[PDB]
Amino acid sequence: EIVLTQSPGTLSLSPGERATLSCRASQSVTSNYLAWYQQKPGQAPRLLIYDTSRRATGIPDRFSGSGSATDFTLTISRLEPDDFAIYYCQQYGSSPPVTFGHGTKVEIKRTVAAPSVFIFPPSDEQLKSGTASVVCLLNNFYPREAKVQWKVDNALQSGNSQESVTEQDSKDSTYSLSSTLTLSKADYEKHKVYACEVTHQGLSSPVTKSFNRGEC
Amino acid sequence: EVQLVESGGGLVTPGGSLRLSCAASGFTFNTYSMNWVRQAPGKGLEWVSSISRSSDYIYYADSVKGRFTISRDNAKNSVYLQMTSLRDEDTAVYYCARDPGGMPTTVTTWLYWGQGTLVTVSSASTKGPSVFPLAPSSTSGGTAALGCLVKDYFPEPVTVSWNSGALTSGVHTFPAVLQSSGLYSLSSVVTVPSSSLGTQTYICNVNHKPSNTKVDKRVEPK
Ligand SMILES: O=P(O)(OC[C@@H](O)[C@@H](O)[C@@H](O)CO[C@@H]1O[C@H](CO)[C@@H](OP(=O)(O)OC[C@@H](O)[C@@H](O)[C@@H](O)CO)[C@H]1O)O[C@H]1[C@@H](O)[C@H](O)O[C@@H]1CO
Ligand SMILES: [Zn+2]
């Protein structure tokens, strides 16, 4: 098989700038049978370029492909917030085994924005079910990097929370993050203070949102 | 208008069999190779198999040879993929794909793609989710937050809308996470001005098609 190595793994640039993506092949690709795809989360791949340099129909001129043999390049000029996606290269000049690269993920850079933080006690409905989930929300922030720590009665938690992050927003290029702490219903009723502590580049000091098990 | 529509995916036990369909329209079907390409959750793309315009040339990836069989009917504008002896490594979104046209061989690159049908290979049983409300409290710069916790379901996917689609601004529906128990979980949140909590009702419309689950939950202040 022909191995395709894409670089860089992740790309972060500002709107209007130029993104240069590399695709290197372990063997020479016959007749420049190399394609480029764009894939946004939740969607099928979008063919941008095939035959190294031929733009697919409807693709703007800001997407240009070049190269030959073992070195291929996709160039995305005048970057839009629409361009948040992973970009794959795909060769088809070999024998039936056609191969794909592992992708270059492109993020749109913007000014630093601190998150707004919210915390949700487990619903009375869920406590009626025998389980307890505590949710901490981070909304409309940038960059993606953020530290979220759970403290139960001031005791730092570990390994009992799972995070999930949204795609970069189409308009303001921000992220939103959720952190869900899981614990038994018995231990939830055995403690009072539940706090979510957030560290982010847009905050001079970490922010803490908390509640006591008797609020309303 | 070129359209490809896959169908037939779902939950299947390891070692089982599943047949996928793909109907096409908007082009002369009988002059095109048809192709199946899959993508495992969180990974890249992998070509599965292709078939020439009149079924004379049939190609497979080594990972599916002797297990998957591709076929087509030009009178029904359909290409099919019969899968047998399914493995965990076969869990993927399966795409129907077509080349840009005028291509020199059966397997090249693909301009048109279907929506894709999700195939989940596991012996875990189907389970619909529980939908718990995330009540708004009493305020960052006048902003409140509410949501719905969609907990413990299998398999993927679930969809979430708010007020039957009327509410879209400020909504953040997070990708699901796989818990240690093997069941999935996700949250869908909305931020709203605090005073809107008294002048508007908020209902999350959760849909888990693999279990025929439709849940509308009214989210209210505690
Ligand atoms: O049989 P396969 O697997 O075929 C592989 C590809 O050649 C086709 O999938 C296709 O892209 C060709 O363009 C198609 O065929 C027309 C030429 O015979 C092309 O027309 P075209 O010149 O592209 O003009 C129109 C089309 O672009 C499109 O708009 C139209 O069809 C919509 O209704 C296009 O339709 O393999 C071929 C190949 O190895 C060789 O031709 O011999 C094999 C015989 O089986
Ligand atoms: Zn690979």
Residue in this structure with the two tokens 């993920």, named with its chain if needed = A105
A-B interface: how many C-beta pairs under 8 angstroms?
A: 126
Same-domain check for residues B117 and B136: no
Task: Beginning with the edge strand found earlier in the chain, give each strand of the sheet holding A193-199 in spatial order.
Answer: A155-156, A147-152, A193-199, A207-212
* Residue A17 phi, psi dihedral angles, 5° rounding: -80, 180
Residues B205 and B97 in one domain: no
In this structure, the dihedral spanned by the alpha carbons of residues B147, B153, B157 and B162, taken in order and rounded to 10 degrees, is: -20
Give the helix ranges, DSSP H, for chain B: none
Residues B170 and B115 occupy one common structural domain: no
Indicate the DSSP class of residue A57.
T
Instruction: Tabulate helix, strand, coil % of chain A (nearest 5).
Output: 5, 50, 45
Spatial contact of A24 and A101, defined as CB atoms under 8 Å apart: no
Assign A30 to helix, strand or coil: helix
Single-letter amino acid code for the residue at A117:
V
Interface contact A180-B187, CB threshold 8 A: yes
Walk across the sheet containing A63-68 and list its strands.
A4-7, A19-25, A71-76, A63-68
Q: Where are the beta strands (DSSP E) in B40-98?
A: 45-51, 58-60, 68-73, 78-83, 92-98
Overall size of chain A counted in residues = 216
- Burial state string for B37-52 with b = 16 or more CB within 10 A and e = fewer than 16: bbbeeeebbbbbbbbb
Q: Per the structure, how many domains does chain B have? A: 2
Among B121, B155, B188, which residue terminates a domain? Answer: B121
**Among residues 142-181 of chain A, which lie with CB inside 8 Å of chain B?**
162-166, 176, 178, 180
Supply the range of the domain harboring residue B135: 130-219
**Residue A68 distance to chain B (closest CA, Å):** 17
Asked whether the beta carbons of residue B135 and residue A118 sit closer than 8 angstroms, the reply is no
Which residues in chain B are closer than 8 Å to A56, comparing Cβ atoms? 100, 111
Ligand 1 pocket check for B32: Cβ under 6 Å: yes
Q: Which two tokens stand for residue B35?
A: 């192709």
Q: A175 with A202: CB under 8 angstroms?
A: no
Domain end position, chosen among B71, B94, B121:
B121
Interatomic CA distance for residues B193 and A205, integer angstroms? 26
How far apart are the CA of B120 and the nearest CA of chain A, in angstroms? 17
Experimental method: X-ray
Identify the residue among A54, A87, A139 best suited for mutation to test binding to B, counting B beta carbons within 10 A and taking the highest. A139
**Matching CATH number, A116-212, of 2.70.170.10, 2.60.40.10, 1.10.10.10, 2.40.128.20:** 2.60.40.10
Q: What is the CATH number of domain A4-108?
A: 2.60.40.10
Q: What is the CATH number of the domain that holds B153?
A: 2.60.40.10
Buried (b) or exposed (e) across A75-114, using 16+ Cβ within 10 A? Answer: ebeebeeebbbbbbbbbbbbebebbbbbbbebbbebeebb
Q: Are residues B185 and B142 in the same domain?
A: yes
Query: Cα-flanking dihedrals φ and ψ of residue B88, to 5°?
Result: -60, -35
Which residues lie closer than 8 Å to B9 by C-beta, 6 or more apart? B18, B20, B94, B117, B118, B119, B120
Residues 6 or more apart whose CB falls under 8 angstroms from that of B212 comprise B128
Strand partners, B69: B82
Q: Closest partner residue to B45 among A45, A125, A135, by Cβ?
A: A45
Within 13 Å, how many C-alpha atoms sit on residue B126's CB side?
13
**Are B139 and B206 members of one domain?**
yes
A123/B174 touch (CB, cutoff 8 Å), yes or no = no
The alpha carbon of B52 and the centre of ligand 1 are apart by a number of angstroms equal to 10
For residue B100, the distance in angstroms to the closest alpha carbon of chain A comes to: 8
Strands laid side by side in the B68-73 sheet:
B3-7, B18-25, B78-83, B68-73
d(CA B127, CA B125): 6
Choose, out of A31, A180, A198, the residue to mutate when testing the contact with B (most B CBs < 10 Å): A180
Sequence-ordered list of residues with C-beta below 8 angstroms from that of A95, at least 6 positions apart, any chain:
none
Considering every ligand atom shown, identify the ligand nearest to the alpha carbon of residue A2 and give its number: 2
Q: Are strands A63-68 and B202-208 parallel, antiparallel or unpaired?
A: unpaired
Residue B102, C-beta contacts closer than 8 angstroms, at least 6 positions apart: none
The domain boundary residue, chosen from B121, B156, B186 = B121
Identify whether the C-beta of residue B6 lies closer than 8 Å to the C-beta of residue B72: no
| Tokens at A98, concatenated | 């056609």
For residues B111 and B90, membership in a common domain is answered with yes
- Cα torsion for A194, A160, A203, A206, to the nearest 10°? 50
A141 by Cβ neighbours in 10 Å (0-12 / 13-18 / 19+) ranks as buried
Q: Residue A198: which residues within 8 A CB-CB, separation 6 or more?
A: A115, A117, A136, A138, A146, A147, A148, A149, A206, A207, A208, A209
Resolution as reported, in Å: 2.3
- Tell me if A211 and B114 make a contact (CB, 8 A cut-off): no
N- to C-terminal Cα separation, chain B:
50
Q: How distant, in Å, are the alpha carbons of A76, A151, B204 from that of B184? A: 36, 24, 18
Please count the CA atoms within 13 angstroms of the CA of A132 that sit on its side-chain side: 16
- Does residue B106 sit in the same domain as residue B33? yes
In this structure, what DSSP letter does residue A143 have? S
Could you give phi then psi for residue A36, rounded to 5 degrees?
-130, 135
Residue closest to B158 by CA, chosen among B146, B150, B166, B149: B150
Q: After which residues is chain B broken (C to N over 2.5 A)?
A: 138
Placement of tokens 């480029």 in the chain: A36
How many whole angstroms from its chain centre is CA B60? 23
Contact (Cβ atoms closer than 8 angstroms) between residue A196 and residue A179: yes
Nearest of A81, A201, A207, A86 to residue A145 by alpha carbon: A201
Is residue A154 exposed (0-12), middle (13-18) or buried (19+ Cβ within 10 Å)?
A: exposed
Whether residue A136 contacts residue A113, with contact meaning beta carbons closer than 8 Å, is answered with no
Q: Is B27 on the interface with A (CB under 8 A)?
A: no
Say whether both B61 and B109 belong to one domain: yes
User: Is B172 touching A (CB cutoff 8 A)?
Assistant: yes
